[PDB]
Enzyme design. Sequence first.
Site, short mmCIF file in Angstrom:
data_model
loop_
_atom_site.label_atom_id
_atom_site.label_comp_id
_atom_site.label_asym_id
_atom_site.label_seq_id
_atom_site.Cartn_x
_atom_site.Cartn_y
_atom_site.Cartn_z
N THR F 1 0.82 -1.20 0.00
CA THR F 1 0.00 0.00 0.00
C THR F 1 0.86 1.26 0.00
OG1 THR F 1 -1.85 -1.07 1.13
CG2 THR F 1 -1.72 1.32 1.26
N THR F 2 0.50 2.21 -0.85
CA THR F 2 1.11 3.54 -0.83
C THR F 2 -0.01 4.57 -0.94
OG1 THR F 2 2.80 2.49 -2.19
CG2 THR F 2 3.12 4.79 -1.59
#
EC number: 3.4.25.1
Lengths: 233, 229, 240, 239, 234, 202, 247, 204
Positions: F1-2
């Site tokens: 996740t970013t």
Amino acid sequence: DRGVNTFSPEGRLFQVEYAIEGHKLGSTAIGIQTSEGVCLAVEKRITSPLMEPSSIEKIVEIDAHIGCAMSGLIADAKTLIDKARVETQNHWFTYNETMTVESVTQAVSNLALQFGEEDADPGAMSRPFGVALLFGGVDEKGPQLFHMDPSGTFVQCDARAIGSASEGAQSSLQEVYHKSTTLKEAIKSSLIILKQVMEEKLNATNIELATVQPGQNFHMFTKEELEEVIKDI
Amino acid sequence: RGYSFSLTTFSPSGKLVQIEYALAAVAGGAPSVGIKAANGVVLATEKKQKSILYDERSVHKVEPITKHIGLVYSGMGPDYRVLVHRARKLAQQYYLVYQEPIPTAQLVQRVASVMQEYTQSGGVRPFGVSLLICGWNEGRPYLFQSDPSGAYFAWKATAMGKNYVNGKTFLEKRYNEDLELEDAIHTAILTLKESFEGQMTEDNIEVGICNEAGFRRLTPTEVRDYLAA
Amino acid sequence: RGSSAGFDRHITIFSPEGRLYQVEYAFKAINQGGLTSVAVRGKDCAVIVTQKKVPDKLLDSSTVTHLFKITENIGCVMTGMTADSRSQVQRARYEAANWKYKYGYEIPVDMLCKRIADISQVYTQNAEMRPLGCCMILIGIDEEQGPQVYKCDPAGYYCGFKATAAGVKQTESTSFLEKKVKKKFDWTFEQTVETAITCLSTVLSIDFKPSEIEVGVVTVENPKFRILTEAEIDAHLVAL
Amino acid sequence: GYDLSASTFSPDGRVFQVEYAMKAVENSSTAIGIRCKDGVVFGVEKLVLSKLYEEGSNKRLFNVDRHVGMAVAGLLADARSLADIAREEASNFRSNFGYNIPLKHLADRVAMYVHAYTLYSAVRPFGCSFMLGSYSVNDGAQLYMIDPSGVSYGYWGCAIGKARQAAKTEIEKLQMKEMTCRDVVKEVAKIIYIVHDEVKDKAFELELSWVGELTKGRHEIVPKDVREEAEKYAKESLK
Amino acid sequence: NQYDNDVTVWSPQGRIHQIEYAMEAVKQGSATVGLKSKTHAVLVALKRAQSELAAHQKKILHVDNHIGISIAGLTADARLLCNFMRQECLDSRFVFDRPLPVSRLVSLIGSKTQIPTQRYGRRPYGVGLLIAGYDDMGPHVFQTCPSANYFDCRAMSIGARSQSARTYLERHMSEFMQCNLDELVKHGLRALRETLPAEQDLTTKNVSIGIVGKDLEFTIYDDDDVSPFLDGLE
Amino acid sequence: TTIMAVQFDGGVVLGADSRTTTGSYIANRVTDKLTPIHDHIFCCRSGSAADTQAVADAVTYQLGFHSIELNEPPLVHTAASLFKEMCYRYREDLMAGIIIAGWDPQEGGQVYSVPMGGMMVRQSFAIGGSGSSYIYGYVDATYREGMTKDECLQFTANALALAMERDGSSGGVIRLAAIQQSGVERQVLLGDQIPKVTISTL
Amino acid sequence: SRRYDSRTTIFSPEGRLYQVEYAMEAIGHAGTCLGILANDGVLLAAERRNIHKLLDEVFFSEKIYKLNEDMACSVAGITSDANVLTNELRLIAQRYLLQYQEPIPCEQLVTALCDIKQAYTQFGGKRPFGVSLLYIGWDKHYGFQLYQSDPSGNYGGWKATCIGNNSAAAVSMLKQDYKEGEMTLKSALALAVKVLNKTMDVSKLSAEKVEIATLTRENGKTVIRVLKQKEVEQLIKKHEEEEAKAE
Amino acid sequence: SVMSYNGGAVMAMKGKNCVAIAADRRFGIQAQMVTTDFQKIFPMGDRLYIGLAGLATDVQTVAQRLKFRLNLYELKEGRQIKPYTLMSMVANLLYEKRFGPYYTEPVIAGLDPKTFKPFICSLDLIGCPMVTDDFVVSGTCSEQMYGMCESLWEPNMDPEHLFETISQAMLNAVDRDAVSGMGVIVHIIEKDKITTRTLKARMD
């Protein structure tokens, strides 16, 4: 009609005012404080000659230095006696010393008025008690005698009489008593007044008598010594 | 937090006048009728609105409980709704435990147990409603009735609400044991017709049936045809 | 007529006729405030109108409102006791939020009405509390049916209507609306505000100024519950 | 037999227990409030019964929060109970949401609490009414008033107490919408001295308070110099 | 004749007869007197003659090092309240390592006393109090009532026939501030002498005296420790 | 996740990837990690999917009730405080790193970080997630004060592309959201429109 | 509140319990029930109270309620309370069987129920159940038995009892036709029929106004069997014949 | 393992309008035999039996609670239970203790009370019901009786051939298990008969 907690136009608490009237229908007791100890004495009030007289115990022992004499509802007095015994034993357990007559009278008086019928406790009282008490004993200051009411007011006396003939018993105790008695003249006069006011004949099985003094423990009079004293009088 | 004492007590003659008064309340509702036929049951009510303003479609008096049970009432509607909700819950619990549809007799027993609990607890009044239960299980149609006290019976043809005495007095005569469901509907409608004081219409009454396939209330388009005769 | 025996007129227990007198008294409590509401539903709209009589001119009248918002598309109007109605509005808001939280979609008007009605039925049965002395009216747009108008009462009865009226002049204010559902579907177009205002004025003879009423609206074009401004109300009033 | 419980409607749909808890207030000494552009100003005629008490006993102005005042009338014990409830409500709000509670929300919360005591037989309704007041750069001045029944409305000037009739009548001739607090304070002093009865009650005490922009939104008590001047002006005006 | 039984019933005049009766209870007791000067506060009580043989009573009790009270009314309720006040002061010293302000104590007492007056099947505390204490701001002579409201006063007397003591007090309040402790105490004993009937004068065993001040803890004075105070009252 | 968010004058810009893994397997490749808390408030989710979904739901419900009864639009600070309360109360059972961003008529656009632990802070721009550690120097060397909407969109897209090309747990498409006083804007940057940065050759 | 309380559990100025005295009079007007003990088993014989034509006889009985593999009962009073009591009795029997892996004895069952009936008269504020019961059974120790409870909560073993309506005259005539030790099941049936024939105000029995159950031991097994309409009709015919022949 | 602490082996097989259930008799502790007449099959109904294997204490407890509930059900309803209904009730009983479960795996075999149609089923420790049409097994020699039944089973068998097959399977299955044996008992539930037999097995 009313609840149990309900003041009157004079702020009197009807139920306590009735529990107090429940005492003028008991058998008279008498305590007297001396410089050499205390003495308690109570009429037994036998009903019929088929009842065993050794089965009427109105003068119990709270501890090795405190005794109690009751009047009123002998069925009610037993919870108070038990709780006083338990408190004295707790005090010994925790502080390694003996309690005091003041502390015992004060702790017992805190159960009175603890009644009600809503948000009180899981199992709580529903009415006031109907017993008046008389404590005697010796401690680090000497012989002491206290008195307790159903309202929860405890005083310190030197010659008190509770029961159905007290308004006549005190009228003689106030003349007899003086600050220079000995326990023996105390015992004699405490017997003379009983004989004065009772309905039967003061013999050696329809009375009771015990004494605490700075030397000995709580000791009850025997049908040997008691008889000798009565005969001697 | 609530009263703990009973409100229904015995009288010097052994009566329970609170239950008698709940029954007097029931005796002032709207007429209901049930008739058990050879292959089904029929419930028929009087759904008479006060004025034309009231939208008829919104509220119903003949309700289902499971796919094979339905009931009607007479008495008080707000109480009827509580009873309907608890009956639905009772049926769901039974199905959860046994993976089987509940029978009508077990349903009636549990509902009457609840209605009885409301005659002996603290600080409540009894329900002001009697029920008429319908069902079909194991190839047989059933028809029970429950009272405000908690006593249930079993009938072949009964009648509640106002004018129930004359209702059952008339119902006894015509009733045949060989009666088909379609010819029983005529008698149910006719019984209602005896005491209506008006003119019958597809929105004055409600009608539900129950046979082999399940419970359902008839639609006004069908009540029209049945009323045509 | 109906005799009494015991504590009938003091608690919710049956009379010798099965009448529950203590619930017939909350209906009289409804007529204590001295207002009157009227709700009318149309082919694509629901409208509420409410009397706005402030006692004298020291109050901040921007706070004296009988119109309330429950969710974005549901609106309500109360009649009866003020604090009771506030508590009922709080309860309805909580019910409407919990429904969405539990089931993922927005509660319908009839479901909300039934919830409020069974909450009141309990006050009709237990003896330690009293019934709330207030009435309620709800409106909204159902995505399947369209406009809806419902009304509860202190007894737990929650029918649905074509055009309601609650308050002090209930009987005659409904006798008026009786004559106009004969034809034209009671003027089933966005101008049923005319019908509502006319029905409220006919039996009150006030010919209200531009600020002695409140009106609310939901539409199929815009579903949210809107409260029309004074100018908008004035224009309709001016046309009359 | 309908006068004894808050769970019994009269045959005409009334609740006499609340009607009596209202008389309890309808015979207590007067307190007024006045809203202004800049802020609010509270004023109460505090009664001194005997010389023995210290001046400052039985205050009727509290601080519910750092921006909310409060004036009371009726049973002072019930009033103090309500003040603790309100303090509780404001503190919980700040701990939940991180900022100060709006007066509109506080009044709503306290009115619901008061109304909950009008339904049951196990309790009795409160016997005191009260006024609130705040000032916020967002919504400006505000003023509310809650009854023993639990109704809360917004006002421009309120007159809870016994001389409500004479108090309201004289406060309506004021034009408060344009004045300011420094110009209102004097008016509060004057109207309280006018409405005050000097026969039944012989001596009375006067205390004032305000919350506005000059105090930066904090509720305070009027300083002593302003008060002395106000009293002098009122006396001069009275004749 | 149906509003005088429960504490949750208003009369048609907006009064609570039960709370009233609980106050008329407090008037039954024997009179007390308190007053304060620039640096000391003082309580003086009159121990009632119970009988010809019993030690009189306890009417003044320690609450803490700086606080002491004096009661009039139901003694059971009085000591039930005293236990709560003692626990309050003990709890305070445990958490903040400092004493308690008398004002905050009286606030707690009033908030606790008010709750019974509102619920069903409960009754008010039938006891009036008189508190004396020292703090950063000097002495304090608060007074409480069965109806939970309390007061603040320079000098107050409660009990039966205390109307005369109250009149004397106000008539002579003009000099209590400047007066010394000895002068202050005598002013108290004279006022207390006022309420007694004609056949009795203060002796040496029917009076008690409490004192709290700047450099002095709360002390009670016994039967013959009150002798240095009654030597001049001619 | 970013996940990421940056602040400009009038509103904020949000961004995220779309891959949900399980060890070394891609269970979902079109995930939507931006969720609406209110009409003008959003939140980016990272960590445990069930935790973040449950907390977003509870906060949504609480905030809706609060605003409907206070009769006005709510505040980004209120939303952030409700999030912080829940995350601190269940700090030992939950696994959620949130970023709250929105618009209010009183302060406009704000950005708040609530890392796992339950601490709150206001920031100008914030990055979070598993791949955010690879672009700290880039956001330190690229940010400049007082940017506009298009510059913010470009900044966010480039940072997210650089994160996805190196983190093994990130990828898919980019989802952006610029929130303003007018409304919400949602676009997807998929396939060939991902901004390619030069890879070293030879 | 105290105003609305009715005080169901207090003493009277003469030591009575008025709610129990009134529940007994409630039980006074119910349908007649009667039991008779014999050498080879017990029998119950109730009276059908609801005789409407439009009813349904789906149930195997109306007032029998088999409680166990060895016992059975019958009620008089309020049906709604009777249902609660019957459910409770079944639960008690199954709990005993679960704990000891043997069937329960009849006296233990009757005792455990009468405790519940008594706890409703001492505390709680509720009203008491208006129901009287008769029991029949068989156990290892004492064999065929027959008991009876009442609303107050005291029971007692019998040999031929009767509750309900006109139970006074029923017991009066039972005392003069019962002989201890010599009665068989058939003579028991005869006496039961001939007592029911009189203590019912109707002209003569109908074989559908009655309801008859028996209990026997056969091949080490207990059998509880409700008699049928034809059997009852035959018994009535037999009674009709012999009585007619004498006079 | 806990379910291998007392041993045991149960088996049920279906025929043409007939069911058959079988078990072994050995009761022992880890490696030592105590008795050889342990009961593992219980008559829940007229033609409805249940067989339990696993921990013997839990076998006894579950049998007793089940008899409790079934007595109450047949007294309240007024008729006998069906094989399908009994299976659901047992699954509910076992799932009530999902955390801290009984160590027992039951087997049901009966006849439909009105169509006389057979029924076999087995449940896992937590209450998962799987109904089959050929046979079920449970115990410590499950794989051995799987191998036997798959080969020997035929469809539409008579009671005679059904008895022969189930016996010939149980014998050779338990002849290769250390903690099972000491004899086998076989119940044959026909329509109007219930025949019981005891086989001669090995005692080592």
